[PDB]
Amino acid sequence: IEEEDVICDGCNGPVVGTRYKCSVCPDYDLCSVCEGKGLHRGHTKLAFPSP
Ligand SMILES: [Zn+2]
Ligand SMILES: [Zn+2]
Numbered sequence: 001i002e003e004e005d006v007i008c009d010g011c012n013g014p015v016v017g018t019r020y021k022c023s024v025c026p027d028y029d030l031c032s033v034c035e036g037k038g039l040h041r042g043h044t045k046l047a048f049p050s051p
Pocket of ligand 1: 035
């Protein structure tokens with residue numbers, strides 16, 4: 001099966017459960033562990049469910 005997946009831009013792990021996305025940039029995603037690191041500082045990240 002070949003499918004589109006959401007991959008964490010902080011650690012390359014799967015983004016499952018809560019998905020953090022940049023409020024400004026398209027195609028930016030963090031898992032909940034990496035969001036706690038504060039990555040992509042300067043842009044607010046938004047909490048969403050994951051696909
Ligand atoms: Zn991560
Ligand atoms: Zn951004």
